[PDB]
Amino acid sequence: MFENITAAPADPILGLADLFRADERPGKINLGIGVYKDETGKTPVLTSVKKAEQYLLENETTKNYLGIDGIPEFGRCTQELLFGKGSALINDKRARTAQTPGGTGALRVAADFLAKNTSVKRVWVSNPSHPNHKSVFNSAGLEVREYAYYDAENHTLDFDALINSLNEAQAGDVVLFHGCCHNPTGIDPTLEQWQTLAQLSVEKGWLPLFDFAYQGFARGLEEDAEGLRAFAAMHKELIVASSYSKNFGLYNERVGACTLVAADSETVDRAFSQMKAAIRANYSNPPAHGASVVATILSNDALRAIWEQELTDMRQRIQRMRQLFVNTLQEKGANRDFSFIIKQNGMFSFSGLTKEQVLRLREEFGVYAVASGRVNVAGMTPDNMAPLCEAIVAVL
Amino acid sequence: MFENITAAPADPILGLADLFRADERPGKINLGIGVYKDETGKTPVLTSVKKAEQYLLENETTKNYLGIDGIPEFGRCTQELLFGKGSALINDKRARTAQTPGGTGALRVAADFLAKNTSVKRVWVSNPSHPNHKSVFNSAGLEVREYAYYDAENHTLDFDALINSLNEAQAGDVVLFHGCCHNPTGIDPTLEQWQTLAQLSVEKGWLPLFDFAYQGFARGLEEDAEGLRAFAAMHKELIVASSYSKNFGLYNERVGACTLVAADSETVDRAFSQMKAAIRANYSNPPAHGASVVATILSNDALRAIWEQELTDMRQRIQRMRQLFVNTLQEKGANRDFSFIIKQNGMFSFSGLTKEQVLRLREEFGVYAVASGRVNVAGMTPDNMAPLCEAIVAVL
Ligand SMILES: *Cc1c(COP(=O)(O)O)cnc(C)c1O
Ligand SMILES: *Cc1c(COP(=O)(O)O)cnc(C)c1O
Structure with missing residues (x-):
């Protein structure tokens, strides 16, 4: 009955959690699902x-x-x-x-x-x-x-x-x-x-x-x-x-x-x-x-x-992470202007990255974001801010 | 858009609880929903x-x-x-x-x-x-x-x-x-x-x-x-x-x-x-x-x-309630023979009651049972066993 069933493609959002919850790389960074994180990096x-x-x-x-x-x-x-x-x-x-x-x-x-x-x-x-x-x-x-x-x-x-x-x-x-x-x-x-x-x-x-x-x-x-x-x-x-x-x-x-x-x-x-x-x-x-x-x-x-x-x-935290994002991004000499990011609201950010960029980010650097270039500002931490910004700038 | 929608008929099971609550008859009994009751009549x-x-x-x-x-x-x-x-x-x-x-x-x-x-x-x-x-x-x-x-x-x-x-x-x-x-x-x-x-x-x-x-x-x-x-x-x-x-x-x-x-x-x-x-x-x-x-x-x-x-x-408590129920039923004058009730398993017994009897019990006496004659034995307690059997008995 089920011999013919076909596999369904991973949930663009949900699935990321698995992929992420499986790579044994020290400083990975999950920027995928929309869950709030505190300064230490957890949802309490x-x-x-x-x-x-x-x-x-x-x-x-x-x-x-x-x-x-x-x-x-x-x-x-x-x-x-x-x-x-x-x-x-x-x-x-x-x-x-x-x-x-x-x-x-x-x-x-x-x-x-x-x-x-x-x-x-x-x-x-x-x-x-x-x-x-x-x-x-x-x-x-x-x-x-x-x-x-x-x-x-x-x-x-x-x-x-x-x-x-x-x-x-x-x-x-x-x-x-x-x-x-x-x-x-x-x-x-x-x-x-x-x-x-x-x-x-x-x-x-x-x-x-x-x-x-x-x-x-x-x-x-x-x-x-x-x-x-x-x-x-x-x-x-x-x-x-x-x-x-x-x-x-x-x-x-x-x-x-x-x-x-x-x-x-x-x-x-x-x-x-x-x-x-x-x-x-x-x-x-x-x-x-x-x-x-x-x-x-x-x-x-x-x-x-x-x-x-x-x-x-x-x-308020998030509002702090979005200012700190464009800033470090800027100080890390990103090509483009990322100022719009300050103008958006809620947990995310429509980064502007392409499919391949967001793909590379992951293999190359273990920084997880949604395919569409949707990033989760609330997962951003002053401690992961620098390495994340390096990743971003390097594929740009 | 919604001006023609019609009202749905009430759940036969979940619908009773509406009426039961909404009822004002002091000695009401509830044998509707398959929910376990204790000696005191509480679902703890x-x-x-x-x-x-x-x-x-x-x-x-x-x-x-x-x-x-x-x-x-x-x-x-x-x-x-x-x-x-x-x-x-x-x-x-x-x-x-x-x-x-x-x-x-x-x-x-x-x-x-x-x-x-x-x-x-x-x-x-x-x-x-x-x-x-x-x-x-x-x-x-x-x-x-x-x-x-x-x-x-x-x-x-x-x-x-x-x-x-x-x-x-x-x-x-x-x-x-x-x-x-x-x-x-x-x-x-x-x-x-x-x-x-x-x-x-x-x-x-x-x-x-x-x-x-x-x-x-x-x-x-x-x-x-x-x-x-x-x-x-x-x-x-x-x-x-x-x-x-x-x-x-x-x-x-x-x-x-x-x-x-x-x-x-x-x-x-x-x-x-x-x-x-x-x-x-x-x-x-x-x-x-x-x-x-x-x-x-x-x-x-x-x-x-x-x-x-x-x-x-x-x-076991339920098991004890089945025996008591057919019993009381009997020496309380029950026309029919309800012993088949002892040989069923679980919270319910299929009384063998007519839609009209169940409708009546409800209306005359305050006793809630599903319209198919399905009674919740688990809701039966020794302190309710009697007024219950008397109600049933008068409708036989
Ligand atoms: C998270 C989300 C939902 C789903 O809500 P849940 O309570 O998690 O099911 C629906 N819409 C938007 C825009 C969301 O961000
Ligand atoms: C109670 C019951 C259900 C409903 O189960 P829930 O866990 O309440 O959703 C379904 N089927 C049967 C036969 C039941 O007795």
Whole structure:
């Protein structure tokens, strides 16, 4: 039965971990997956989290089945983080959140839903975009197309190509955006550009689909959401797939949410009923651990205080590594100008390296980056900064 | 976009818990969801588990993503559980396991796989069977045919019918089997019957898919594995979806696995690489908490010796509840003869109640049972045994 199966090609992102986790070279450098690292070079369990985790221990009396849509405070907390502690969607009971296995569980369930209970046929992902976006949407059945985004020559958002491209979109089509910290470009639209698009959408009849993974890594928790909230005020319906993987450092405990907004309480209610039906024949219900962690903190004033300190420390570090990168790079006499790198935001950097360069970097020097030239600034350390910069300059 | 979606019908199983909670009848009893209860009517968290959890608290240093397929001890330990310590599948390296969210997640990753990489067109699920089986398979896109199992009047396994119905099963079809504790009948085939069914499939050309979720609730860890192992001995290709939800009291953690066996180490390895691509476009990688726990309980001698006693207690307690139930039923005036109930295995008994009786019990008396007449014995306690038997009795 399986004699004919064919091997699948390594995950461009995930796979790198293996290759890296196998070369027995003293000073290698993994700059591949998007996980935060500290000055010493490791992803520590955040402190607020360890705290929540003790509380769980001491206070948990049961492991009984969560509902299909998980814990309800988790859902509730998620919505204010998204929309506002005030907002209308909350206030008229327009949204319904389902706890899910990370951002990817959210993306996928939105896809099972759309594909089975609506009339969507295509989805519009940017160019570039996270490699797995395509895989997921295709699994559900939907056809993906691409819109124009980045201007590789200038290192800016090519708005007018972005717009024209989309003009190929049809009313009733899905158009996925990244709420902030564009991946892999790190270039986000401006609040006016967000408003514009928000309006255009509304006229062309598009169904917005936000992929929100880095809330708090660009400017702040609340201001990171302006685009999303810009759309929220104009739209009648929208789905949102958030993730607390990168902002709570809960990577492995798989924590995120799928937020369904619709015209009115009765409507979203009816739509949610199927969305559950879709969770039911996938993973059944959600894993408690992380969503319990997250909730505990989000509902405790002290804990939340500590957690919000941790986040800004992460953010700030990275901001330091990006200045220190172009600098050393400069002092190591790199050919080109790498100044744009300072202008991008989030963990990564769209380096500008070609396929062969990034390949060589690896064999030659054991410095791991994604094929596309996507580098992980958060894996950069003052201690690995010099050798890394030598590698880079030498293949350039 | 969403204005026409219709409301989905409630889960027959997971849907009861809604109503039960939402019910205000003081003396209500709940016999719905297959969740274990203790003398006091609480689903507690195992000692060994709590113990394992302390450890993780003190010893865990990172949240960094696990791999697509999870934690390697985990898969290692589960293959020993399944096939036995010195197994040949283990020695010839024919198996490959992936950590999944729950057993359902196991089920679904198998369907997604088979459907996308093989030429499977349909699967054969028992009659009756767990009601979610159909839905997961339909989601993958497969077609579900029913075989003949249970013999209503005699409350016995109808081998003849089983055998002749399966006779419509093409070579290349999938045939789901319940390793032990047949949900919802509690009737399992004998070791010979297992042996007979193992030959036909081999003769017939089917792919076995095993739902293994109650390992240890029938006779014992190893004893419960016999049928599987009987099948593993002659099969070149197999699939096993096992769960850690019942025997570890980890319900909301989502622990399970999808074990892929093949002909040789190179074939299985190839086939798995596709499986790993299926997982990737679904939830991405699995939840570390609950798999960690299990991996710890099974790898540490003491922690394991304890766990094994906990399971023994669960199993027996239920056994004690079956005898009491038919008993009380009898000297409380039961028309029918319910003793067949003593000869079933696991948490449930297939009462033989009419949809209308179950509907009534619920409405008149406050007693929650699935609409097929499936009752959760494990939820039965000596302090509820009486009002329960009285309710039933009045509807007969
Ligand atoms: C990491 C990432 C995801 C996946 O989120 P997980 O919670 O890790 O599954 C989705 N989208 C973007 C843009 C990401 O960076
Ligand atoms: C409980 C059960 C399942 C669901 O298992 P989870 O680990 O809860 O996802 C699947 N199949 C059968 C036969 C079950 O009894």
